[PDB]
Amino acid sequence: EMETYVNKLHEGSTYTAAVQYNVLEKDDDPASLTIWVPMFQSSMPADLLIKELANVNILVKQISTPKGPSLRVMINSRSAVLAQMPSKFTICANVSLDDKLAYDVTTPCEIKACSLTCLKSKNMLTTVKDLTMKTLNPTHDIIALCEFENIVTSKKVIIPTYLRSISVRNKDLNTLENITTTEFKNAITNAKIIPYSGLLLVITVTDNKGAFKYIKPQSQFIVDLGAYLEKESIYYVTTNWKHTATRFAIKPRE
Questions:
Q1: Cα–Cα distance between 101 and 194 in angstroms, integer?
Q2: Cα(72)–Cα(34) distance, rounded to whole angstroms?
Q3: Helices (H), the chain
Q4: CATH, residue 28
Q5: Which of 7, 89, 197, 217 is spaced 20 to 30 A from 104 at the CA atom?
Q6: Cα 44 to Cα 17: distance, rounded to the nearest angstrom
Q7: Phi–psi pair at 8, nearest 5 degrees
Q8: Non-local CB neighbours of 129 within 8 Å, separated by 6+ positions
Q9: Which domain holds residue 57?
């Protein structure tokens, strides 16, 4: 038994699979950690692929690298389609680990939950890094304010995540309508936050005007929240933090 989650944010038969496992070390006093698999494309219907993703075996090994502690992940599978999926990769230990793991010892883990999110094909995904350097002398930073309610404690949590920097004409500041266009505002209001990279904000870019200038129309603009979750348990977060709204701020730089 295992919890499974399928989020279809795209209708294509072909999609980018964004997969995240919550796992428990097979031991007494077990380490708890979350693994996200490098994105890969598939054309197997999501509701079938999740069945295959649920039947893998995971091992991890904590290592030291120039960037700090890292987790080497190995995924065993008898499912033909998972030839499509990376089987060996590394992720940052600080985001992955809740807590409890020895170094350089390959460690089997029990899968508690598997989440599969279907995104657009990779050529239709835009990252924050993609937009860095598009404006050389920005005047403002655009921040998404991701609001959650912890359903156990009823407390509200806001994670402010950086989207991009932009230069705004003086004339445009008086209403901001040419920057925070109708398309932009709706896209933020309707943004989704899914279980990947800890959490991943996904904004559908419906236009390339204003705050969306230089982005490919109809792309999904994907943004990491994992850097803000290093001191949390990701499994606790994806189980207990309910995404209640997404707001934005267009902050002057200085």
A1: 27
A2: 12
A3: 46-53, 93-96, 128-131, 182-189, 234-240
A4: 2.70.20.30
A5: 197
A6: 10
A7: -95, 90
A8: none
A9: 1-120
